[PDB]
Amino acid sequence: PQLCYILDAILFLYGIVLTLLYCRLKIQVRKADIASR
Amino acid sequence: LCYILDAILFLYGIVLTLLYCRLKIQVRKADIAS
Amino acid sequence: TQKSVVSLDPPWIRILTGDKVTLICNGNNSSQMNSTKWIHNDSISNVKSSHWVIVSATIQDSGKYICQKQGFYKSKPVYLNVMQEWLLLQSSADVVLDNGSFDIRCRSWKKWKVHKVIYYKDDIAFKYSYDSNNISIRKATFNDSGSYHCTGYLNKVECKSDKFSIAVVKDYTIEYRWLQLIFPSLAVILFAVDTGLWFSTHKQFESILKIQ
Amino acid sequence: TKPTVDLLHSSCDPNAFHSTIQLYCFVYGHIQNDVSIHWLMDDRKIYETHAQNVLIKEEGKLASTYSRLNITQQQWMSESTFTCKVTSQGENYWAHTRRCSDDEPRGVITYLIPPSPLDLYENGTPKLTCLVLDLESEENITVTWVRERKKSIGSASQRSTKHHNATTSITSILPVDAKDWIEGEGYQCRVDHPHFPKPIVRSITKAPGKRSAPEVYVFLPPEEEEKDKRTLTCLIQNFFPEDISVQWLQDSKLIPKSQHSTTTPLKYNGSNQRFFIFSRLEVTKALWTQTKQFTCRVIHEALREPRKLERTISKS
Amino acid sequence: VNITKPTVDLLHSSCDPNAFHSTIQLYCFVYGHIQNDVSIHWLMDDRKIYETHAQNVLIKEEGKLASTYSRLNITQQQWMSESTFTCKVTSQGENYWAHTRRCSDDEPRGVITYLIPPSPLDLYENGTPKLTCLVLDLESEENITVTWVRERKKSIGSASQRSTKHHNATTSITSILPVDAKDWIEGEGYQCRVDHPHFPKPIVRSITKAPGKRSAPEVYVFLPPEEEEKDKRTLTCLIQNFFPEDISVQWLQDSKLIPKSQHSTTTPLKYNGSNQRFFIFSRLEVTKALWTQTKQFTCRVIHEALREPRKLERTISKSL
Amino acid sequence: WQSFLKKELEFLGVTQVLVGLICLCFGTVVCSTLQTSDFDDEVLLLYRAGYPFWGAVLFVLSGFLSIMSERKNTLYLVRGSLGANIVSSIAAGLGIAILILNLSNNSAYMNYCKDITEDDGCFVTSFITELVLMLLFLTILAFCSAVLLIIYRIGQEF
Ligand SMILES: *[C@@H]1O[C@H](CO)[C@@H](O[C@@H]2O[C@H](CO)[C@@H](O[C@@H]3O[C@H](CO)[C@@H](O)[C@H](O)[C@@H]3O)[C@H](O)[C@H]2NC(C)=O)[C@H](O)[C@H]1NC(C)=O
Ligand SMILES: *[C@@H]1O[C@H](CO)[C@@H](O[C@@H]2O[C@H](CO)[C@@H](O[C@@H]3O[C@H](CO)[C@@H](O)[C@H](O)[C@@H]3O)[C@H](O)[C@H]2NC(C)=O)[C@H](O)[C@H]1NC(C)=O
Ligand SMILES: CC(C)CCC[C@@H](C)[C@H]1CC[C@H]2[C@@H]3CC=C4C[C@@H](OC(=O)CCC(=O)O)CC[C@]4(C)[C@H]3CC[C@]12C
Ligand SMILES: *[C@@H]1O[C@H](CO)[C@@H](O[C@@H]2O[C@H](CO)[C@@H](O)[C@H](O)[C@H]2NC(C)=O)[C@H](O)[C@H]1NC(C)=O
Ligand SMILES: *[C@@H]1O[C@H](CO)[C@@H](O)[C@H](O)[C@H]1NC(C)=O
Ligand SMILES: *[C@@H]1O[C@H](CO)[C@@H](O)[C@H](O)[C@H]1NC(C)=O
Ligand SMILES: *[C@@H]1O[C@H](CO)[C@@H](O)[C@H](O)[C@H]1NC(C)=O
Numbered sequence A: 001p002q003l004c005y006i007l008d009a010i011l012f013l014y015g016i017v018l019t020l021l022y023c024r025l026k027i028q029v030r031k032a033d034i035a036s037r
Numbered sequence B: 001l002c003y004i005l006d007a008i009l010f011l012y013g014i015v016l017t018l019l020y021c022r023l024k025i026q027v028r029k030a031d032i033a034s
Numbered sequence C: 001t002q003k004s005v006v007s008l009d010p011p012w013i014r015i016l017t018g019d020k021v022t023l024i025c026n027g028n029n030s031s032q033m034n035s036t037k038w039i040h041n042d043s044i045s046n047v048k049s050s051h052w053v054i055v056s057a058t059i060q061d062s063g064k065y066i067c068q069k070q071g072f073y074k075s076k077p078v079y080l081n082v083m084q085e086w087l088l089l090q091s092s093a094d095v096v097l098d099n100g101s102f103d104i105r106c107r108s109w110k111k112w113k114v115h116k117v118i119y120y121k122d123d124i125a126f127k128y129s130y131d132s133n134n135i136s137i138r139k140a141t142f143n144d145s146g147s148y149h150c151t152g153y154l155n156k157v158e159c160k161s162d163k164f165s166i167a168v169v170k171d172y173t174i175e176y177r178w179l180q181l182i183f184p185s186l187a188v189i190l191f192a193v194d195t196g197l198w199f200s201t202h203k204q205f206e207s208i209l210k211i212q
Numbered sequence D: 001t002k003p004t005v006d007l008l009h010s011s012c013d014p015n016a017f018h019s020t021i022q023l024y025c026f027v028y029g030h031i032q033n034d035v036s037i038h039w040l041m042d043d044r045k046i047y048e049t050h051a052q053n054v055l056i057k058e059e060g061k062l063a064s065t066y067s068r069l070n071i072t073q074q075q076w077m078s079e080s081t082f083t084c085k086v087t088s089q090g091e092n093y094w095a096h097t098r099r100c101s102d103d104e105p106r107g108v109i110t111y112l113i114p115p116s117p118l119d120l121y122e123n124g125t126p127k128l129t130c131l132v133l134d135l136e137s138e139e140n141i142t143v144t145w146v147r148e149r150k151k152s153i154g155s156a157s158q159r160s161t162k163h164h165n166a167t168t169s170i171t172s173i174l175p176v177d178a179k180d181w182i183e184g185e186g187y188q189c190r191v192d193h194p195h196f197p198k199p200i201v202r203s204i205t206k207a208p209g210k211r212s213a214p215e216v217y218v219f220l221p222p223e224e225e226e227k228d229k230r231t232l233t234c235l236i237q238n239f240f241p242e243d244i245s246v247q248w249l250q251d252s253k254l255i256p257k258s259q260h261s262t263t264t265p266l267k268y269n270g271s272n273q274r275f276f277i278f279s280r281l282e283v284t285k286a287l288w289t290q291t292k293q294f295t296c297r298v299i300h301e302a303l304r305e306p307r308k309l310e311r312t313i314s315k316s
Numbered sequence E: 001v002n003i004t005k006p007t008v009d010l011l012h013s014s015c016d017p018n019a020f021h022s023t024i025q026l027y028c029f030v031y032g033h034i035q036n037d038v039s040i041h042w043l044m045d046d047r048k049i050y051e052t053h054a055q056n057v058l059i060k061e062e063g064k065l066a067s068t069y070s071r072l073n074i075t076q077q078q079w080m081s082e083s084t085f086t087c088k089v090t091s092q093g094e095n096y097w098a099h100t101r102r103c104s105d106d107e108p109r110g111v112i113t114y115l116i117p118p119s120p121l122d123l124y125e126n127g128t129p130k131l132t133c134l135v136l137d138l139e140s141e142e143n144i145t146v147t148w149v150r151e152r153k154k155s156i157g158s159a160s161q162r163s164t165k166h167h168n169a170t171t172s173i174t175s176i177l178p179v180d181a182k183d184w185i186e187g188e189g190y191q192c193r194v195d196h197p198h199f200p201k202p203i204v205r206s207i208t209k210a211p212g213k214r215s216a217p218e219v220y221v222f223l224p225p226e227e228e229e230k231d232k233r234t235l236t237c238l239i240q241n242f243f244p245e246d247i248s249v250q251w252l253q254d255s256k257l258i259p260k261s262q263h264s265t266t267t268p269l270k271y272n273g274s275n276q277r278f279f280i281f282s283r284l285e286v287t288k289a290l291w292t293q294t295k296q297f298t299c300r301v302i303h304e305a306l307r308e309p310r311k312l313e314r315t316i317s318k319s320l
Numbered sequence F: 001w002q003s004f005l006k007k008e009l010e011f012l013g014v015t016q017v018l019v020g021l022i023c024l025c026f027g028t029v030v031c032s033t034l035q036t037s038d039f040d041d042e043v044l045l046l047y048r049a050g051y052p053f054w055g056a057v058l059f060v061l062s063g064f065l066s067i068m069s070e071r072k073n074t075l076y077l078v079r080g081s082l083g084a085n086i087v088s089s090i091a092a093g094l095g096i097a098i099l100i101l102n103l104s105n106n107s108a109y110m111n112y113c114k115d116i117t118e119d120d121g122c123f124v125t126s127f128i129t130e131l132v133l134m135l136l137f138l139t140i141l142a143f144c145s146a147v148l149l150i151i152y153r154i155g156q157e158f
């Protein structure tokens, strides 16, 4: 009930943090590749 | 049902966290080596 | 203060055409004019009294009703069902909580007396009464869930009411739970986005370990 | 002279609005010009009669005439006992009426089942039945039994039954004497409840009409039929009344009534009333060919004593 | 010669619950008719009352005018049913009427609809089956619409409709729908809807062939019994082991059809215990003269579950 | 510290694009799934003030313009993306005010709710409350990113 909803909200926040870190890694790899090219 | 559907997504997020930590050390090692 | 409580007083969620019904908000015996916002069928009606007295119910007067008194919240919506039947099983509720009560009645068309009424639950009769009066089922259990109907005799003619499922539940179904399925769904895009932001991160890294 | 004072009345013509019921007090055999007819309702006067004593006929000293009373409809719907008072030779005579009280108050359907002829003329222990159906519950229903002659009455056996349609039924079975039933004793079942407006009074008697003795014939199983079952047939025809018992036997041993059927009795030829039934007993081929006999006995109240007519079927 | 109309009253005795006869004494009085030119007949809701021997009693004679009455004995529960008892007075070929009911209140007596399937005689022998929807206890004909709907096809035939004004001031509407036979063997479910502006919804009856395992009747015709040397001869047709109970039975005297008034057929009785078979008896009692004139009687039986052309007849003859 | 923020500036606009698209998704599921006449106009102050739509438009637009201004370094994208970040920070501040007012209204509603699952009202109010909570988290993220674009693109011109 309440515990599942709270845990699912923190799962969503985990998804937010993971897509932010993956976007930062994406721009870092793209900047390294556009410096290499 | 929400407990199994959330546990499988915590596992599915742990997988991507391990993949992100695997890529982070490789990017920082390439950054160390020019 | 609290939420509004819209309440019929003839408290029958199923009425026939021409039945006088009155829609009361939070609840007193006073038609407090210009003090209640009435929403019928998700559209704000011009009736602003605390008592919406429908002196003759129309099929158009069915559907959803919400009251909101001045200084109060919007109500839990009640569903009137004005019907056009030879014999109607009136009920005070369609979903009843456990340890709760509900009345049923067997009414015919425009104050015609129903006589020799048999009330059935899932084709099994539980009560016979000549004068069509209240059957007050107090302290409802899961036994009291079922497809209730009633057979009556008209001015001399046997007619059978349409069945009506009255469900007794531990707690009300709250009819919007998939909204809490929005957030795990917005994980299975975002995490899947991560898989894209793994794959297109790996391949561009796979192309950067080859050049050296 | 004793005038014959029967009282008649009009009632609802369905094809008319009919605001007035026409009460009528008829007197026959009274002495000519020696009649005084007055009307009362609930034993109080009506001088508002404007009575029209219409003379019918004269036969020497004797005479016949009648009076008519207009009443409104709600004076009749009140179930008020109207009455006619006749003064003839100074003597007084009374005629009573009211509306026929509702035979199903609160929708309670009361059946007065007569004794079966098997109980009356073979078992010797007849039993009337008052079947009081469509009750809300069996509390405060009192069932009274009324005879004609004797204050002594048998003790009724009352049982109750809640049915599949949640209607309680009360079966009050009164053991009666067969002799008084032959003589024509009248028996009432009066169902009474605190909020019945009036008691349910059902009356029953031995059924009136000319008694015709049944002719009983038994037909063999058909000669084309050499199949696995053989059907035995009993024609019972030209009998009044409808109340008849038919039994089937196997070598003077009684077959149960669930093994043979009997048709609903059908009226025939008019205008004096006669009935016919067919009793049908289906047996197997093995049970038919066991070197035996079957009989069809018929118990009826138009048969000579002991009111049992046997017709025997056998292949030997 | 002028026709003189007589005053026709319809009086009766009432209930005496302290009495024991349980009988209502209806009287129809006729005043002002012509001597030896009156006939009073009795009806109970348009049904003529034959089995009563209703007694006709003369009242008086005033020149060429006369007064008589007729007495009808009815059962208590016949009166309590609120059925109209009608005396029809025929004088000079003119019919005068009086009606009576038990006096009831102003309740609006409801409408009863029966949907009646076609006879097997029309289905499998005449080839012209007709459904009929009988609508009863209408206070008037007006604004009633009787519609017919099928289930599979749309080619609905021209449903005729007639109306009867009964003696009990109720109007009946009998709507005849001619149907095709092969649709009814195949299992078409038809449906009659009766609509009025004062109805909530139409009174709807639905019908089809009776469901169950079909069984051909075997029929046996018995002779008049060997002990019968009387003046009438009874012929029995035992019709056995059939489903459904919808069956048509005719009697044939030398292959000439006998009207249904001269023979009587018992109501179908069920047996075999959920194997669902039925039996009837057709009884034709002829005179001894009509039997001894070397005719040849036949019990023709038309049932659904028979082999084509769905009639199965049995010869019976005196000589053979 | 100027070079410490230019490396992450593209991500610092990608977070605005992300917050805007999740704002748009929350707005379209509230607009489509909910029958908003059933619920109060102060419980639904998020949607009645329209914040997910004009927040989604401005966050997506400002983040996209910041992505292209980082990827092109054009002198017309800069001072064009700076104004987009100014209006994004203004919209995010108004959004933060709207979301605090909606948490206040949701707490005032849930005072008269003995359970989260009494009916549709308390349940939709709780769902809106924690959606306001994780829209407040995203709006704080987008507002901090907008302030960081403002700080970088103003301090560069000093
Ligand atoms: C509720 O169900 C009961 C039982 O199914 C119904 O009782 C039945 O009522 C019928 C007619 O009212 C009775 O038939 C009558 O039988 C008597 C005696 O055999 C006969 O003389 C009459 O001519 C008539 O055919 C039937 O016996 C009776 N069943 C029993 C077991 O007593 C009752 O009518 C139903 N009530 C309602 C409101 O539906
Ligand atoms: C007024 O008088 C009419 C005419 O007699 C009454 O109509 C009759 O009603 C009975 C039952 O209500 C009908 O019997 C039914 O017949 C069908 C067809 O055979 C059968 O399938 C049913 O099971 C039932 O036995 C009868 O046919 C019908 N007579 C006519 C000529 O239509 C009516 O009931 C009377 N109403 C009052 C209030 O007195
Ligand atoms: C309803 C919500 C939960 C879904 C919205 C989230 C994603 C669809 C979007 C939001 C912003 C997007 C990011 C915006 C900008 C970028 C930079 C972009 O850069 C390129 O296009 C690289 C060009 C090249 O490969 O040469 C790569 C995708 C990425 C990380 C996007 C990945 C997908 C993201 C996370
Ligand atoms: C309010 O909504 C109800 C349905 O929830 C409407 O009732 C329907 O009315 C149409 C014709 O108007 C009927 O065909 C339906 O059978 C009715 N449905 C039910 C469930 O009753 C009602 O008309 C609406 N009223 C207004 C004013 O819009
Ligand atoms: C009958 O039922 C109605 C509606 O449920 C209710 O308002 C009323 O109080 C009841 N009365 C009795 C006597 O049960
Ligand atoms: C409810 O129904 C079940 C199943 O028939 C029965 O066992 C149980 O006793 C019922 N409950 C009560 C309170 O009688
Ligand atoms: C009684 O009524 C009839 C018809 O309603 C009328 O002709 C007659 O004059 C009336 N008689 C009296 C005395 O009122």
Ligand SMILES: *[C@@H]1O[C@H](CO)[C@@H](O)[C@H](O)[C@H]1NC(C)=O
Binding pocket: E142, E143, E197
């Ligand atoms: C019945 O039909 C007539 C036309 O034949 C119409 O004028 C009338 O309004 C209808 N209704 C009633 C109640 O008469």
